[PDB]
Design a protein around this ligand. Structure first.
Ligand SMILES: [Cl-]
Ligand SMILES: [Cl-]
Lengths: 111, 111
């Protein structure tokens, strides 16, 4: 199967996660009334096998549109008002066995 | 120190993560021009030590406001138009050594 395994709602981690999630639900609702669990239908857990990459990168705007080929060695804008350079910090969460990546954090400032 | 460790931009995982992040940057920008890396200033990696909880929970709206005490055993609304019950799926990412939790996924449907 390879998926999450059942875990008792009495287990300290499960209960903390339940209290946490319900607390976030209530914090984010527009409701003046409090909601709480009537019933936990299923509680499971899984240890993920991932890795985080943290990249600090300067990006430059190229003279190529996104609709044209050979993008990787496309020259950068040189004309004063068309050029844009940004310093970006990217945090990527990868799960190698699964072949997936997710961009967890991304922020850019002008250069 | 305990933080992310430097990793060469030539390493296959780092380069895939770099290509991925730049691809997401371009997909999300409103720019008709393509941007690409001028320079990688820093590239690091870290294996996180976390666990995922997956909870399927029925929530009910209580008669208590969020501004009053004893919320955990507050009765549920019984009056026809004030009661609300939701079935929610919550995925919580916990990092036990750090004491933190993040709500990675949260969706609710009416009951
Ligand atoms: Cl465990
Ligand atoms: Cl590694």
């Amino acid at each position: 199967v390879g998926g999450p395994m059942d875990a008792s709602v009495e287990e300290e981690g499960v209960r903390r996660a339940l209290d946490f999630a319900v607390g976030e639900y209530n914090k984010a609702s527009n409701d003046m009334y409090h909601s709480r669990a009537l019933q936990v239908v299923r509680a499971r857990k899984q240890i993920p096998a991932g890795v985080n990459y943290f990249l600090d990168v300067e990006l430059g705007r190229t003279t190529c549109t996104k609709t044209q080929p050979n993008l990787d060695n496309c020259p950068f804008h040189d004309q004063p008002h068309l050029k844009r350079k940004a310093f970006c910090s990217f945090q990527i969460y990868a799960v190698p066995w699964q072949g997936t990546m997710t961009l967890s954090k991304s922020t850019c400032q002008d250069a």
